[model samples]
Target: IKLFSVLSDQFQNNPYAYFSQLREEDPVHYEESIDSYFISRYHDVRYILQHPDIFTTKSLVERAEPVMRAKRRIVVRSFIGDALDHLSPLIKQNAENLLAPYLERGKSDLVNDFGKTFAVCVTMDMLGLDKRDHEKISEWHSGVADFITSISQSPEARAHSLWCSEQLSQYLMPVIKERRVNPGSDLISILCTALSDKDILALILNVLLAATEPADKTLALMIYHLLNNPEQMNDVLADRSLVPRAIAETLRYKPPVQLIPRQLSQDTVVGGMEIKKDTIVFCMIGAANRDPEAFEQPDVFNIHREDLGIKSAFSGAARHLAFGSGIHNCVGTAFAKNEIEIVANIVLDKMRNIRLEEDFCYAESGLYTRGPVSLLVAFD
Candidate 1:
């Protein structure tokens, strides 16, 4: 069967079956539609993620180059100045601003509420955006997400991304200018010294699209997992120490950004398949995490397994393939993970019996990112 056909089904229904078969049969298969090689094996996933030297992030940058270069005309490189790890602390600094409301409420839809606002607020505060402008920032991120994940791959996605960039740049220009005159410890001020306007704009566009959406999806998915498994949730509630492990397990089981795309710099071998230079390689984190070889009885969700251990060996080699591997790994993952743990603690502490209130839809409707469209959940 054609890959898209399989993808369509995977998106609409269960993707794990498709992922498992791919890992077992052809861990690295070529797709004619986009002309890329995709790998899902555990070893291959780790190899690519850890060895950035061999498997680079050039292609990811290339795809964003069109808008990146355009954003260059406007100043907005704040998102790209440092690795996402560095940015996490800055985001956490503002968590109290956005998260306080939700925590006080004790319940949130995650996607519509926290997913949309929490990350954007952090992005806004980081950008030194005023509280009133938070909605505009969310809209920009939404446009960027719709365009990035539309899977239409037509010039539309690029156009959509560019549109957000232009609007966001225009709006941020004055802010950047103001920050420059009276610099603060915000990202805008930091970028003023570190990057050009165009770079700043591109970084904003990148952070909005690549970082926020998946992190939101991951958050929702993890919430869904824990809600259904109250026993696990209770355990974490009783002992906060297990929250991180639960989050790690949630990532291993249900990664928001399951598919990773890369372009081979030169001809290389992956998963025993010879990939030609310039070939797009989609590393299937979904399949890799569930590979029986990687995780015993991968389908069964168990957070407290001895192998999973506390403090999780999720970095380096034992790293779960969720945040991806190598250079293209999710830059804001540390912050995202910390946020997930924090949010989980909040949700479990307040709610008694959390349940999936409606049909869950973990869709793969986009080429760049994959996640649940709507995870209607409730707890008392």
Candidate 2:
């Protein structure tokens, strides 16, 4: 029997199985109602990612444009690179702070207790947002991600997300107005020099979507994979150096952002399938990462695996399409690596014998992005 659609509940629970079927049967399988090609194989995924001009991010006008527009701004480029490092001290400090209340209990939910707000905390520091507003920011952050992940799958999701965006605009408009006169070095201040307040508002909403969602989902997925694999978890806990490798492997095996949509800029064919201009192609990064043709035993989570190019995995030359290769690559790629490593190392330092909660059964959510609904663990 053949699997029907990637959007099916079965695929959401465990996409790996559907990926294999798609790769083996029809690499460029088309969904009739969805009107998109789900490209599953490694080679095909790479081709689409590398050729951004052909497979353009045209969909962002609807999905998110601030992300697309922010690419060329000098301040944006510099901030995404150099200015981001300053968060190091802040990240370590907050991770310790977040863990403080948890360590005393000997058990905590990773997704809820830490991963959910960790990125937002450091990001709030980055933007110099007031401490009191962070609670509301987190709420708005998830709203945008929910909207993004929905990708028009739900009209209600879109409506609610737009409402959240409107509320965020109202809240941030004053900050932009003040920062224009005051001119601090924070992201909002720096952007005020170059962009309209409207642009700045949209950019921050998209930035928080980038900042908050994947980091939380990906970090939880990494720990879930690491701890679930006992020997590697022990290796990472002891060696410490293997932490990056583990993170890279998890990106390959269980990428938090699984489906990347690119609208066709011009007519082209991928994997022997003919395509037309402006058709949205969903590059199944999770499938490509697991393609045996790309990485040996891609299903297994082995941090020490020789096939994975750990050092290059985060960059343009990455073997895994987890970060997507070339132009439309997640601009936050480098920052993501730093954040995951920093957070994981802190957890390792604080907790002992970290393992899943009693009777914990794995459950995941999201189509655009995928991660455990909850990851509770007991540690001493």
Candidate 3:
């Protein structure tokens, strides 16, 4: 299957059909256009993610070199160095602050209001920037999302990547200077004292960009499914506490990020397939969440479904790979889950009789993000 064409269509609507095909017919399949391979099953995908030494993101920024400058660029590795000692909690704290307001809103346009907006604001707040120009930040992130998620590799995609990277560089420097003199309880302050000018700015920019982008998109997908399934929504409404399980179920049933790319460190074999060193392999998450091998009736959307009496399987060091796995796993995971829970509960509490608008249209982005350009809903 040509993912470029199929991905475009999949973005337009539900992609389960295409994922089902990829899972059944060619679990490890490739599309020549992008020169990338796709893996659908859960175990197979998890293996690649867990063994990051083999399939790495070290070259992710390099692959987009046309859009990023490694020496001075921020994309390769953000606040990910020794500064992580101080930065992750700061990022999490600010993320919580941003979520508090929306969780109390009762209901809102999640994609526009919660995911995209909060992701931008919390990330900036973590950087010690005033949470004032959220709209501009959101706009930039939208472009960033397209650049990061799109498989197009078209001029549009390239341009978006270049522009966002440039914008990030332009937007972060002044603050990087101020934090140098008068640091505060934010990530920038910590990074200013901890890293070089270029690396500090890059960390701020990366967190600002990716911090909420993934979770916001994840929450948006959860919103879509809860709205699509009233029983599931009602179940959560009956007991607000079950929201976490429901969140995991939504992740399992329909992962926000369908494919995560990993580069092999050496010629290694996983799930019986030999991948050469330096080959880019995609861990197809959507397929894994539905793997009958790991989950019974993997294709069904069962909110309460868990092995035996277990409710949530991803917390702790147990590993879910949803936020990724191993050393490079998302450090912002706690923040993402907290934000998603807040949004999911808010959407469920206020909205009733929610359903997809017949004219629903999904905004297209890279394979890693999913949501509607505009998801219309009516509440009683």
Candidate 4:
């Protein structure tokens, strides 16, 4: 009952309790209504991730249909396939640019003012979308992303998501056409050369919808951890190099992409339990990141965690499941790391004596995906 009720309002307030219980009792769980299996341990989840052909990620965008899904995968690979050196400067510049307006105010909602704003700006610039329509694009992106991650999707939510996708597609058509004739370095230009209108639309949806939220949420979560741990914050301030470690640790502690959904291609045994074909597999990333068998003091947040770093394949330091693993590992891992580090350093430099607003604490929402919706803070 607790497993089924994990997404319920009460449990969401502190889902860690349910996750820990499940890891102890039923690391591999099944939900009858959704006809899905939940895998919630480091090794079990890693097993599922390693066998991507057997447990596919195609189910994540089933609504896009097979053709679109196939193309969507290619679009993403092509979009992010190259070196991100060129994108790095833009990310840093955008963070500083977005933070400019908020710094004058001296107080702001970091989620909206900094995190969301920076992500949207970078997303738009990356897609080569019109700057004037950035706000509208962000609104549509939120609608679709929220729909994707909603624990229980209603008919209305489905229709809304469809509408958002349609509208976004229509808006992108002209730009995509223009790019075909006169290609630029942005994603649209690259995608237009090979992908059709529908394929490009799917790519756009995946990029704008899926990419923006995680970036913003991850950035906000990082700030939340640093603010809560002033000692670490001072350490980061004293040595900016620790920012990357802080980012990695925050992701391990509170990954924005908490749930990775997959569908079994065939019957397989996970955690010594036989799972049937076509069953939805929810890789509990948050749980895997904190599995005691995998890491020492798994619950404690430590930026200098040597165990969390990438290690040799033959069993060395333990790596966190923050980015999942294997074939479906996040393509934007480097992009996200660069973006968060740049944005965080900007905040640390600009926000003098930044502190949480009175009586305010980090609160997260959503069942499948989770992050702080509001993180208000003040700075001199």
Instruction: State each model's CA lDDT, in order.
Output: 0.64, 0.79, 0.61, 0.75
Highest lDDT scorer: 2
Candidate 4 lDDT over 148-240, as tens digits, reads 676655788778777876777678878878888998888878876655676666666666766688888877888888889889988888999
| Cα shift from native, residue 178, model 4 (Å) | 1.7
Per-candidate TM equals 0.81, 0.93, 0.78, 0.90
Q: Model 1's lDDT to the true fold?
A: 0.64
**Model 2 segments more than 4 A misplaced:** 1-3, 58-75, 151-159
The model with the greater lDDT, 1 or 2, is 2
Candidate 2 structure quality by residue, lDDT tens digits, 10-85: 7677887778888989888787657788888899889889988888774211336321112443345567677558
All candidates: CA RMSD (Å):
5.0, 2.8, 5.5, 3.5
Task: Quote the positional error of residue 126 for candidate 2 in Å.
Answer: 2.3
Off by over 4 Å in 3: 1-14, 59-108, 153-161, 308-320, 348-366
lDDT for 253 (candidate 4): 89
Worst 10 residues of 2 by lDDT: 60-69
Q: Per-residue lDDT of 178-236 in model 1, one digit per residue for the tens? A: 77778887666766775566656566556556656666676677776766677886776
